[PDB]
Amino acid sequence: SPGIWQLDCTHLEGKVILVAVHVASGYIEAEVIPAETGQETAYFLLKLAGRWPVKTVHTDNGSNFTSTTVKAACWWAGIKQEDGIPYNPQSQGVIESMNKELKKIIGQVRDQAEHLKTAVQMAVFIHNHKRKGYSAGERIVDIIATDIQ
Amino acid sequence: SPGIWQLDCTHLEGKVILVAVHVASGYIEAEVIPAETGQETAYFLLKLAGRWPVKTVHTDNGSNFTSTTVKAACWWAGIKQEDGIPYNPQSQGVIESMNKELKKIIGQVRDQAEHLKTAVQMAVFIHNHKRKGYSAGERIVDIIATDIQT
Numbered sequence: 001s002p003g004i005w006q007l008d009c010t011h012l013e014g015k016v017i018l019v020a021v022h023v024a025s026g027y028i029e030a031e032v033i034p035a036e037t038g039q040e041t042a043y044f045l046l047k048l049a050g051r052w053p054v055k056t057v058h059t060d061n062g063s064n065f066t067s068t069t070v071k072a073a074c075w076w077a078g079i080k081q082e083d084g085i086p087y088n089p090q091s092q093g094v095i096e097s098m099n100k101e102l103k104k105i106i107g108q109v110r111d112q113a114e115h116l117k118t119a120v121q122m123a124v125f126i127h128n129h130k131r132k133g134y135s136a137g138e139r140i141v142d143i144i145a146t147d148i149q
Numbered sequence: 150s151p152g153i154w155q156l157d158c159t160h161l162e163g164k165v166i167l168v169a170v171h172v173a174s175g176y177i178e179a180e181v182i183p184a185e186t187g188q189e190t191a192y193f194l195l196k197l198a199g200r201w202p203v204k205t206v207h208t209d210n211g212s213n214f215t216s217t218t219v220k221a222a223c224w225w226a227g228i229k230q231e232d233g234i235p236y237n238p239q240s241q242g243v244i245e246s247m248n249k250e251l252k253k254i255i256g257q258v259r260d261q262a263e264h265l266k267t268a269v270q271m272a273v274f275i276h277n278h279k280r281k282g283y284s285a286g287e288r289i290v291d292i293i294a295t296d297i298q299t
């Protein structure tokens with residue numbers, strides 16, 4: 001499971017925050033986009049896969065699963081595109097709790113930037129560095145390193 | 150040196166490609182921007198530091214070094230902003246060759262996307278995954294993991 005990621009789309013301020021979660025570590029990357037389209041999702045995945053060894057992505061909905069733009073990007077980047085059906089029901093709850101936590105952090109920083117995109121990157125930073133004791137940023141690196149070796 | 154990064158700005162197609170290189174591994178992140186400004190650089194560093202444990206950034210030029218916008222982002226993210234003076238002359242050459250390699254890869258993929266930004270992300274992917282043997286992506290993770298066990 002070092003290579004498995006989950007996509008997650010949440011809304012704030014009339015915009016969309018697209019999140020990718022590294023399932024085993026809870027590490028995240030995120031971006032603000034005007035709306036979820038296949039093209040936005042495809043580009044986001046392309047970025048993610050150039051930065052981390054992304055083997056599998058559990059897509060966030062059926063439209064992204066279906067999208068030929070998303071499929072083409074997964075093909076290009078060597079990603080196995082899978083559904084995100086919560087066969088383990090605890091997955092829904094974990095995602096919902098992460099979205100709530102992220103929005104809480106965005107609120108706490110919202111004053112330290114004019115633009116939502118900046119606040120979201122601040123939120124990513126705080127989420128990934130938070131010791132819960134190791135941080136998510138530490139866990140993902142350790143997981144992948146162990147896999148390499 | 151697990152935490153040291155170097156900024157690098159190169160130009161293509163009338164646009165600017167801002168690159169951050171993890172010095173010890175050669176791993177990179179990059180984005181296309183219309184022009185280098187303090188604000189663009191500040192935002193790029195904010196992104197980078199939320200994703201990797203960035204201790205020190207050797208800035209690419211004196212304007213970004215001076216920039217109060219860049220300084221504010223570095224303060225926020227806990228980054229030590231340093232100059233990028235190549236006291237070791239090997240550094241100019243390493244960056245130049247990287248820019249040349251990246252532009253080559255962009256040309257090789259240029260036909261697989263309408264937009265330069267897409268091609269640049271494809272170039273990042275190819276650069277980071279290229280086995281030279283380990284890839285830069287493998288080296289950065291090994292370097293940081295080794296550091297964390299300290």
Ligand SMILES: CC[C@H](C)NC(=O)c1ccccc1CN(C)Cc1ccc2c(c1C(=O)O)OC[C@H](CCC(=O)O)O2
Pocket residue numbers: 111112113114115116117118119186188189190191192218221222225
């Ligand atoms: C960042 C941490 C510091 C402590 N906060 C402040 O100094 C601060 C605090 C409150 C209000 C304004 C500011 C000043 N601003 C300039 C912060 C900023 C930097 C880069 C950006 C921004 C923003 C933004 O205000 O959101 O917005 C997106 C933009 C995208 C790239 C591009 O378009 O160039 O990059």
Ligand SMILES: CC[C@H](C)NC(=O)c1ccccc1CN(C)Cc1ccc2c(c1C(=O)O)OC[C@H](CCC(=O)O)O2
Pocket residue numbers: 037039040041042043069072073076260261262263264265266267268
């Ligand atoms: C990508 C790999 C595949 C094999 N290549 C093609 O299928 C392909 C090949 C040639 C020409 C057009 C295409 C089709 N396009 C749609 C590729 C694409 C996807 C997401 C993007 C793009 C682009 C783009 O063409 O550059 O541009 C930036 C945009 C930014 C996010 C936003 O604005 O939504 O995200």
Ligand SMILES: [Cl-]
Pocket residue numbers: 128129137138198199200201202
């Ligand atoms: Cl981190």
Ligand SMILES: [Cl-]
Pocket residue numbers: 049050051052053277278286287
């Ligand atoms: Cl990689």
